[PDB]
């Protein structure tokens, strides 16, 4: 025995499956309109963006 | 006090220290009417 | 037409502290990690490669900037930080803020340094979302080399203790500037210093005998303007090498292999990529510059 | 028919008109500005007809090429169409003459060992002679390597486009300035082809963060050695999107093995031309986040890229 | 130090104080704090089991 | 040797409103994010109290100014379109191969 | 609301803290405990409702 | 989004003899010291800095060329000239006159240089505006950046003979240095039998720049000790000479070093750029007998 004792800590992960409740009329939603912005122009394909 | 010991402690953090951050121009209202000075404002007169 | 476009979404609002730290800085340069339209807050500034509890260095953090592409601010809205990047050939308008007010001109040569003057000057605090945004500093040649000149001085003299006025103050024409050096990680600086014995020891061996003889004729009675650095005193070696009769084609073939390594010093004395201002106002500080990666 | 059908190409392939807006005559300023936003409201919406008019907008796409000459024995009779191309110059034989070297070629110019490249030695033996297949035309293989002068005469060119193999002269059209368009297969460009023997990757490590982009750079390097006390080079390639200051400090960590045995040799002898080391060339920037596609040919594992813009920096010395 | 009504509106959304990685071999520190879906309750009650 | 089939894959078109989650939120015919930089709605919510005959000085009812905001949420969708899509959307009138 | 009526002074706040503790131990992962019970349905229903 | 045709004002006409000498070349690369095209002649060329009056300087001229946008001519008109402004990745056309001639091998690296020749076949006098037009020296790089190679050693031994005339042979210092050997075609320089002095801003440095190079690596070796210290520095003892490791630092003390050290730190980067910052072109299509090539450029 050396001249001390000691405490030990770990951590852990647990994959849980969760239940989520959401009551009625909590958020007001605001759906906009989509868009098009062209960028990153290569020679083969031009990557569009919505 | 200092945020506690009060009626309705949920509305503590909403009413007290959020409105201090936001209310710099008092613009949480719905603009409806305007008082244009005269028939033609010309953007120079003080509009109410 | 093309539209390079970067806007930073945010999950919790700017505060009254970091508004005025950022509303005042409407134009500057800060890096990125990834090229998109959108970006999380933990990839903007210099604060990825450097942190408070991690002991920074003044080499690899600058050396990290050669990987990235770097962007220019546009707006500071209370939600979002609006930016734009640098297209490999496109002009912009940038207007610096920096509290060490330095004077640019038209037709200059600017680079970007990590902040070496003071960290609390540059490290802004972000009480909303924790991750600090350390600002890099847009800097010309004459300063940008001179602090790299100042660095490779000092981290040799960091061991020569084992003082302060001689070894850190940036000798600019007009002012001197103390750096922020107490607790660094100078081992990447220790590489570059030991990368000099790769050259400065080895450049010494093929020095020709001809140009060394000019030094003995110089300091005696033919004193030139800048050469009073010698202060009328020779180095000890200058009379210890000149024993050769000055054979010319020896020194011809000596200076060719010498001429190679002068270009090799670019690869060790690099800055970041390079800025090309052509039009510029001094009272406004706004410029007009196209991107050159270096 | 020519005025009937072939006009409807050129009646449609034109660039858009830079739209003209009348300042004065106020009843015509509004007729102008109204027909801008109705042209702009197309380029926002993701519907079908709104799309294809945002595609006539096109940048400058015109890189120029190089008409060369090859002694068709110095040409290996096939190529994987996306090789690197050197151009070696010592003296002009005729008026318009040229000689080219592939990355499969330069292995066969020193007679180097099979330990530095045990992959292309079986490959590039059938493609050429035995090292003397290019010694018939250059008696200065040694003295360029002796004096340290081989690393300056090579001019980096780029990839191929298409070459016409004939009886005595193979006509080669290379590619420069950027994107090399292919010929036999349209709409696809010349895929630059590097072997898996010669490209050395720089990124691999434990998981333990690096920024991405559109920019990983291929480096053209050269490392001296002296096998059997004979002058001999080493083609070695790289791939790194990590700036210029890092990789010269990283190529030296790659080729530390050469330098350690090197000054075991010249500890007791001084030849000033034996002190210069090498050089770096930059060839162009692959989009970083793309794929080096492992393609098998004649074995010969080959990486091939896509959308390769090309450039050429000077040969910069390093230790 | 703050009152607990702040602490409920902070615990549901904010990331932890330097938590651990998943799916890799050793317990690394997370630096890409953008994808790991941990909700650790070792903070609020200040415990160790 | 023969062919025996190339088979149809279908992406299941389920939008937001078609789920049962819409009984939690509030959905309108809203249009504009690009106009309105984030403001607020300043509620002031009234308050019932108990009246009873205290020996104290009793409670004046209180009036709480209640502080609501909005939250900007960006979403980006991505398309690549190759060069053959670019051109032969224009040309026409050849043959049944066309 | 019965646990917070008098007002959040110092003695009520800390008594809430040690009331998380006994509730975190017993009534968490409540579906997994419900496979090894005599009662069954009147544990989940007393948890959910 | 293009206009490269810049008409630059004179204030009067040309001379009479300078018709065909300016018809002798029709395309060359001139600098352009103004972002605008509404421009005098007193700002386009090297006469904003380099002229008769200023001291013969090299580094500021070396700073100037990449600092200044270039331009390519198309036709000589009696009212004004025709500059086509330099963009990155720009096409142009060269029909040369350069004395002496330098052969234009295609596909090599083709740089822009400061001139050092005799200034009679190197400039054209305009007393219409007081402006000697200075064509930049345009030589390919393996010739060009190594034109300093034979000259420099030829330059230094003239300085020791200017203080002690019993040291250097003349006709032996000529032969290996007066003729640049590349491609096999020998080229002779211009000798300057007047009294070179432009190169005082290099060679007078490089002798001072050769002073403490074998002095700086004494303390540098034994300084920063770890076992993580670099491995090849043990191998790199096999280069450094024997007299170098015999220097005593009794002569120079530690706070005395700071001025003498930083000068030697200063010129090991300021010199490294001026051989790298030579902005530079390439030829993709070349004609020999016509001397009308089609080529491309990017300033660097």
mmCIF file of N, CA and C in Angstrom, chain D residues 53-142:
data_model
loop_
_atom_site.group_PDB
_atom_site.id
_atom_site.type_symbol
_atom_site.label_atom_id
_atom_site.label_comp_id
_atom_site.label_asym_id
_atom_site.label_seq_id
_atom_site.Cartn_x
_atom_site.Cartn_y
_atom_site.Cartn_z
ATOM 1 N N UNK D 53 -33.332 30.249 -68.150
ATOM 2 C CA UNK D 53 -32.810 31.545 -68.553
ATOM 3 C C UNK D 53 -31.778 32.094 -67.580
ATOM 4 N N UNK D 54 -31.557 31.423 -66.452
ATOM 5 C CA UNK D 54 -30.452 31.732 -65.560
ATOM 6 C C UNK D 54 -29.213 30.917 -65.883
ATOM 7 N N UNK D 55 -29.141 30.372 -67.093
ATOM 8 C CA UNK D 55 -28.051 29.505 -67.508
ATOM 9 C C UNK D 55 -27.274 30.040 -68.692
ATOM 10 N N UNK D 56 -27.792 31.057 -69.374
ATOM 11 C CA UNK D 56 -27.062 31.667 -70.471
ATOM 12 C C UNK D 56 -25.938 32.550 -69.950
ATOM 13 N N UNK D 57 -26.069 33.034 -68.712
ATOM 14 C CA UNK D 57 -25.021 33.769 -68.015
ATOM 15 C C UNK D 57 -23.792 32.895 -67.817
ATOM 16 N N UNK D 58 -22.691 33.234 -68.481
ATOM 17 C CA UNK D 58 -21.548 32.348 -68.503
ATOM 18 C C UNK D 58 -20.250 33.124 -68.346
ATOM 19 N N UNK D 59 -19.288 32.581 -67.598
ATOM 20 C CA UNK D 59 -17.988 33.250 -67.472
ATOM 21 C C UNK D 59 -17.082 32.993 -68.664
ATOM 22 N N UNK D 60 -15.841 33.455 -68.564
ATOM 23 C CA UNK D 60 -14.857 33.288 -69.627
ATOM 24 C C UNK D 60 -14.270 31.885 -69.538
ATOM 25 N N UNK D 61 -14.525 31.063 -70.552
ATOM 26 C CA UNK D 61 -14.040 29.686 -70.601
ATOM 27 C C UNK D 61 -13.244 29.500 -71.885
ATOM 28 N N UNK D 62 -11.945 29.791 -71.829
ATOM 29 C CA UNK D 62 -11.081 29.661 -73.003
ATOM 30 C C UNK D 62 -9.632 29.511 -72.556
ATOM 31 N N UNK D 63 -9.188 28.286 -72.292
ATOM 32 C CA UNK D 63 -7.751 28.042 -72.153
ATOM 33 C C UNK D 63 -7.136 27.591 -73.470
ATOM 34 N N UNK D 64 -5.896 28.014 -73.696
ATOM 35 C CA UNK D 64 -5.193 27.684 -74.926
ATOM 36 C C UNK D 64 -4.208 26.548 -74.697
ATOM 37 N N UNK D 65 -3.837 25.895 -75.791
ATOM 38 C CA UNK D 65 -3.167 24.603 -75.782
ATOM 39 C C UNK D 65 -1.779 24.729 -76.414
ATOM 40 N N UNK D 66 -1.131 23.589 -76.642
ATOM 41 C CA UNK D 66 0.199 23.601 -77.223
ATOM 42 C C UNK D 66 0.449 22.561 -78.298
ATOM 43 N N UNK D 67 0.775 23.018 -79.505
ATOM 44 C CA UNK D 67 1.117 22.135 -80.617
ATOM 45 C C UNK D 67 2.598 21.789 -80.525
ATOM 46 N N UNK D 68 2.904 20.523 -80.274
ATOM 47 C CA UNK D 68 4.273 20.102 -80.011
ATOM 48 C C UNK D 68 4.769 19.178 -81.121
ATOM 49 N N UNK D 69 5.983 18.672 -80.937
ATOM 50 C CA UNK D 69 6.533 17.616 -81.772
ATOM 51 C C UNK D 69 7.141 16.576 -80.849
ATOM 52 N N UNK D 70 7.071 15.308 -81.250
ATOM 53 C CA UNK D 70 7.681 14.219 -80.493
ATOM 54 C C UNK D 70 8.367 13.281 -81.482
ATOM 55 N N UNK D 71 9.631 12.931 -81.216
ATOM 56 C CA UNK D 71 10.217 11.724 -81.797
ATOM 57 C C UNK D 71 9.436 10.521 -81.284
ATOM 58 N N UNK D 72 8.712 9.811 -82.158
ATOM 59 C CA UNK D 72 7.682 8.866 -81.715
ATOM 60 C C UNK D 72 8.222 7.607 -81.035
ATOM 61 N N UNK D 73 9.540 7.432 -80.908
ATOM 62 C CA UNK D 73 10.061 6.423 -79.991
ATOM 63 C C UNK D 73 10.128 6.956 -78.565
ATOM 64 N N UNK D 74 10.425 8.249 -78.401
ATOM 65 C CA UNK D 74 10.415 8.872 -77.081
ATOM 66 C C UNK D 74 9.003 9.000 -76.523
ATOM 67 N N UNK D 75 7.997 8.893 -77.382
ATOM 68 C CA UNK D 75 6.606 8.746 -76.982
ATOM 69 C C UNK D 75 6.343 7.280 -76.679
ATOM 70 N N UNK D 76 5.893 6.993 -75.471
ATOM 71 C CA UNK D 76 5.361 5.665 -75.201
ATOM 72 C C UNK D 76 4.046 5.531 -75.957
ATOM 73 N N UNK D 77 3.821 4.422 -76.675
ATOM 74 C CA UNK D 77 2.821 4.423 -77.760
ATOM 75 C C UNK D 77 1.391 4.561 -77.295
ATOM 76 N N UNK D 78 1.106 4.245 -76.044
ATOM 77 C CA UNK D 78 -0.141 4.645 -75.423
ATOM 78 C C UNK D 78 0.153 5.625 -74.300
ATOM 79 N N UNK D 79 -0.870 6.386 -73.939
ATOM 80 C CA UNK D 79 -0.859 7.206 -72.746
ATOM 81 C C UNK D 79 -2.241 7.138 -72.122
ATOM 82 N N UNK D 80 -2.338 7.286 -70.803
ATOM 83 C CA UNK D 80 -3.661 7.343 -70.168
ATOM 84 C C UNK D 80 -4.390 8.678 -70.291
ATOM 85 N N UNK D 81 -3.961 9.538 -71.229
ATOM 86 C CA UNK D 81 -4.653 10.722 -71.749
ATOM 87 C C UNK D 81 -4.655 11.894 -70.764
ATOM 88 N N UNK D 82 -4.230 11.669 -69.528
ATOM 89 C CA UNK D 82 -4.234 12.727 -68.542
ATOM 90 C C UNK D 82 -2.935 12.783 -67.781
ATOM 91 N N UNK D 83 -1.842 12.471 -68.463
ATOM 92 C CA UNK D 83 -0.549 12.448 -67.812
ATOM 93 C C UNK D 83 -0.064 13.860 -67.538
ATOM 94 N N UNK D 84 0.998 13.949 -66.754
ATOM 95 C CA UNK D 84 1.781 15.167 -66.753
ATOM 96 C C UNK D 84 2.708 15.161 -67.961
ATOM 97 N N UNK D 85 3.079 16.349 -68.426
ATOM 98 C CA UNK D 85 3.913 16.480 -69.610
ATOM 99 C C UNK D 85 5.060 17.422 -69.279
ATOM 100 N N UNK D 86 6.286 16.923 -69.360
ATOM 101 C CA UNK D 86 7.450 17.792 -69.322
ATOM 102 C C UNK D 86 7.805 18.240 -70.735
ATOM 103 N N UNK D 87 8.732 19.193 -70.820
ATOM 104 C CA UNK D 87 9.341 19.584 -72.090
ATOM 105 C C UNK D 87 10.811 19.860 -71.828
ATOM 106 N N UNK D 88 11.670 18.951 -72.269
ATOM 107 C CA UNK D 88 13.098 19.041 -72.007
ATOM 108 C C UNK D 88 13.783 19.798 -73.136
ATOM 109 N N UNK D 89 14.585 20.799 -72.776
ATOM 110 C CA UNK D 89 15.281 21.639 -73.745
ATOM 111 C C UNK D 89 16.748 21.733 -73.369
ATOM 112 N N UNK D 90 17.618 21.297 -74.274
ATOM 113 C CA UNK D 90 19.046 21.569 -74.182
ATOM 114 C C UNK D 90 19.558 22.328 -75.396
ATOM 115 N N UNK D 91 19.197 21.893 -76.604
ATOM 116 C CA UNK D 91 19.539 22.604 -77.828
ATOM 117 C C UNK D 91 18.576 22.162 -78.923
ATOM 118 N N UNK D 92 18.178 23.104 -79.778
ATOM 119 C CA UNK D 92 17.281 22.806 -80.892
ATOM 120 C C UNK D 92 18.021 22.039 -81.982
ATOM 121 N N UNK D 93 17.513 20.855 -82.330
ATOM 122 C CA UNK D 93 18.042 20.115 -83.469
ATOM 123 C C UNK D 93 17.592 20.800 -84.755
ATOM 124 N N UNK D 94 16.290 20.799 -85.007
ATOM 125 C CA UNK D 94 15.722 21.442 -86.165
ATOM 126 C C UNK D 94 15.084 22.764 -85.808
ATOM 127 N N UNK D 95 14.218 23.238 -86.701
ATOM 128 C CA UNK D 95 13.565 24.525 -86.486
ATOM 129 C C UNK D 95 12.505 24.425 -85.394
ATOM 130 N N UNK D 96 11.545 23.521 -85.561
ATOM 131 C CA UNK D 96 10.425 23.358 -84.636
ATOM 132 C C UNK D 96 10.469 21.949 -84.059
ATOM 133 N N UNK D 97 11.228 21.771 -82.980
ATOM 134 C CA UNK D 97 11.438 20.462 -82.384
ATOM 135 C C UNK D 97 11.117 20.509 -80.899
ATOM 136 N N UNK D 98 10.769 19.349 -80.353
ATOM 137 C CA UNK D 98 10.328 19.250 -78.973
ATOM 138 C C UNK D 98 10.474 17.800 -78.534
ATOM 139 N N UNK D 99 10.623 17.612 -77.225
ATOM 140 C CA UNK D 99 10.644 16.291 -76.617
ATOM 141 C C UNK D 99 9.865 16.359 -75.314
ATOM 142 N N UNK D 100 9.072 15.328 -75.045
ATOM 143 C CA UNK D 100 8.134 15.340 -73.935
ATOM 144 C C UNK D 100 8.396 14.170 -73.000
ATOM 145 N N UNK D 101 8.097 14.378 -71.719
ATOM 146 C CA UNK D 101 8.268 13.358 -70.691
ATOM 147 C C UNK D 101 7.001 13.249 -69.857
ATOM 148 N N UNK D 102 6.519 12.030 -69.691
ATOM 149 C CA UNK D 102 5.353 11.709 -68.881
ATOM 150 C C UNK D 102 5.805 11.372 -67.461
ATOM 151 N N UNK D 103 4.891 11.244 -66.481
ATOM 152 C CA UNK D 103 5.331 10.746 -65.164
ATOM 153 C C UNK D 103 5.695 9.273 -65.161
ATOM 154 N N UNK D 104 5.265 8.510 -66.168
ATOM 155 C CA UNK D 104 5.787 7.170 -66.393
ATOM 156 C C UNK D 104 7.163 7.191 -67.040
ATOM 157 N N UNK D 105 7.555 8.314 -67.641
ATOM 158 C CA UNK D 105 8.828 8.379 -68.345
ATOM 159 C C UNK D 105 9.993 8.542 -67.383
ATOM 160 N N UNK D 106 9.888 9.500 -66.453
ATOM 161 C CA UNK D 106 11.040 10.012 -65.714
ATOM 162 C C UNK D 106 11.620 8.989 -64.743
ATOM 163 N N UNK D 107 10.901 7.895 -64.490
ATOM 164 C CA UNK D 107 11.477 6.738 -63.818
ATOM 165 C C UNK D 107 12.604 6.113 -64.636
ATOM 166 N N UNK D 108 12.519 6.192 -65.966
ATOM 167 C CA UNK D 108 13.456 5.552 -66.880
ATOM 168 C C UNK D 108 14.566 6.494 -67.345
ATOM 169 N N UNK D 109 14.922 7.492 -66.538
ATOM 170 C CA UNK D 109 15.941 8.466 -66.923
ATOM 171 C C UNK D 109 17.143 8.479 -66.002
ATOM 172 N N UNK D 110 17.198 7.578 -65.035
ATOM 173 C CA UNK D 110 18.330 7.535 -64.129
ATOM 174 C C UNK D 110 18.816 6.107 -63.967
ATOM 175 N N UNK D 111 17.928 5.147 -64.193
ATOM 176 C CA UNK D 111 18.222 3.774 -63.837
ATOM 177 C C UNK D 111 18.179 3.576 -62.339
ATOM 178 N N UNK D 112 17.180 4.152 -61.677
ATOM 179 C CA UNK D 112 17.108 4.119 -60.228
ATOM 180 C C UNK D 112 16.692 2.736 -59.737
ATOM 181 N N UNK D 113 16.735 2.574 -58.417
ATOM 182 C CA UNK D 113 16.433 1.298 -57.796
ATOM 183 C C UNK D 113 14.935 1.006 -57.861
ATOM 184 N N UNK D 114 14.597 -0.252 -57.599
ATOM 185 C CA UNK D 114 13.212 -0.673 -57.478
ATOM 186 C C UNK D 114 12.675 -0.493 -56.070
ATOM 187 N N UNK D 115 13.511 -0.071 -55.122
ATOM 188 C CA UNK D 115 13.029 0.143 -53.763
ATOM 189 C C UNK D 115 12.254 1.446 -53.633
ATOM 190 N N UNK D 116 12.642 2.472 -54.385
ATOM 191 C CA UNK D 116 11.924 3.734 -54.338
ATOM 192 C C UNK D 116 10.619 3.688 -55.120
ATOM 193 N N UNK D 117 10.485 2.762 -56.065
ATOM 194 C CA UNK D 117 9.243 2.592 -56.820
ATOM 195 C C UNK D 117 9.143 1.163 -57.327
ATOM 196 N N UNK D 118 8.668 0.238 -56.491
ATOM 197 C CA UNK D 118 8.432 -1.134 -56.954
ATOM 198 C C UNK D 118 7.114 -1.330 -57.684
ATOM 199 N N UNK D 119 6.401 -0.255 -58.010
ATOM 200 C CA UNK D 119 5.106 -0.360 -58.662
ATOM 201 C C UNK D 119 5.179 -0.093 -60.159
ATOM 202 N N UNK D 120 5.822 0.996 -60.565
ATOM 203 C CA UNK D 120 5.918 1.345 -61.975
ATOM 204 C C UNK D 120 7.146 0.763 -62.657
ATOM 205 N N UNK D 121 8.008 0.060 -61.921
ATOM 206 C CA UNK D 121 9.177 -0.555 -62.541
ATOM 207 C C UNK D 121 8.774 -1.703 -63.456
ATOM 208 N N UNK D 122 7.848 -2.550 -63.000
ATOM 209 C CA UNK D 122 7.262 -3.550 -63.884
ATOM 210 C C UNK D 122 6.411 -2.896 -64.964
ATOM 211 N N UNK D 123 5.776 -1.771 -64.638
ATOM 212 C CA UNK D 123 4.938 -1.074 -65.606
ATOM 213 C C UNK D 123 5.798 -0.439 -66.691
ATOM 214 N N UNK D 124 6.644 0.520 -66.311
ATOM 215 C CA UNK D 124 7.346 1.365 -67.269
ATOM 216 C C UNK D 124 8.574 0.706 -67.888
ATOM 217 N N UNK D 125 8.715 -0.612 -67.803
ATOM 218 C CA UNK D 125 9.787 -1.288 -68.505
ATOM 219 C C UNK D 125 9.402 -1.602 -69.935
ATOM 220 N N UNK D 126 8.137 -1.975 -70.139
ATOM 221 C CA UNK D 126 7.652 -2.262 -71.483
ATOM 222 C C UNK D 126 7.381 -0.974 -72.261
ATOM 223 N N UNK D 127 7.134 0.142 -71.566
ATOM 224 C CA UNK D 127 6.791 1.390 -72.238
ATOM 225 C C UNK D 127 7.989 2.032 -72.922
ATOM 226 N N UNK D 128 9.204 1.697 -72.509
ATOM 227 C CA UNK D 128 10.406 2.332 -73.040
ATOM 228 C C UNK D 128 11.491 1.271 -73.145
ATOM 229 N N UNK D 129 12.732 1.719 -73.292
ATOM 230 C CA UNK D 129 13.859 0.814 -73.310
ATOM 231 C C UNK D 129 14.289 0.418 -71.913
ATOM 232 N N UNK D 130 15.584 0.541 -71.627
ATOM 233 C CA UNK D 130 16.145 0.184 -70.330
ATOM 234 C C UNK D 130 16.885 1.362 -69.706
ATOM 235 N N UNK D 131 16.371 2.574 -69.900
ATOM 236 C CA UNK D 131 17.046 3.785 -69.506
ATOM 237 C C UNK D 131 17.887 4.396 -70.608
ATOM 238 N N UNK D 132 18.402 3.570 -71.517
ATOM 239 C CA UNK D 132 19.115 4.045 -72.694
ATOM 240 C C UNK D 132 18.183 4.402 -73.842
ATOM 241 N N UNK D 133 16.872 4.199 -73.677
ATOM 242 C CA UNK D 133 15.913 4.598 -74.690
ATOM 243 C C UNK D 133 15.809 6.096 -74.875
ATOM 244 N N UNK D 134 16.265 6.875 -73.894
ATOM 245 C CA UNK D 134 16.354 8.319 -74.016
ATOM 246 C C UNK D 134 17.779 8.833 -73.887
ATOM 247 N N UNK D 135 18.758 7.942 -73.729
ATOM 248 C CA UNK D 135 20.162 8.330 -73.715
ATOM 249 C C UNK D 135 20.759 8.424 -75.111
ATOM 250 N N UNK D 136 20.017 7.995 -76.136
ATOM 251 C CA UNK D 136 20.469 8.154 -77.513
ATOM 252 C C UNK D 136 20.448 9.613 -77.941
ATOM 253 N N UNK D 137 19.551 10.406 -77.362
ATOM 254 C CA UNK D 137 19.344 11.775 -77.793
ATOM 255 C C UNK D 137 19.897 12.810 -76.825
ATOM 256 N N UNK D 138 20.246 12.425 -75.599
ATOM 257 C CA UNK D 138 20.802 13.365 -74.623
ATOM 258 C C UNK D 138 22.032 12.741 -73.973
ATOM 259 N N UNK D 139 23.238 13.229 -74.267
ATOM 260 C CA UNK D 139 24.427 12.724 -73.570
ATOM 261 C C UNK D 139 24.735 13.490 -72.294
ATOM 262 N N UNK D 140 23.775 14.260 -71.798
ATOM 263 C CA UNK D 140 23.971 15.079 -70.611
ATOM 264 C C UNK D 140 23.006 14.688 -69.501
ATOM 265 N N UNK D 141 22.753 13.387 -69.350
ATOM 266 C CA UNK D 141 21.970 12.929 -68.209
ATOM 267 C C UNK D 141 22.740 13.112 -66.911
ATOM 268 N N UNK D 142 24.056 12.906 -66.952
ATOM 269 C CA UNK D 142 24.859 12.993 -65.741
ATOM 270 C C UNK D 142 25.117 14.439 -65.345
#
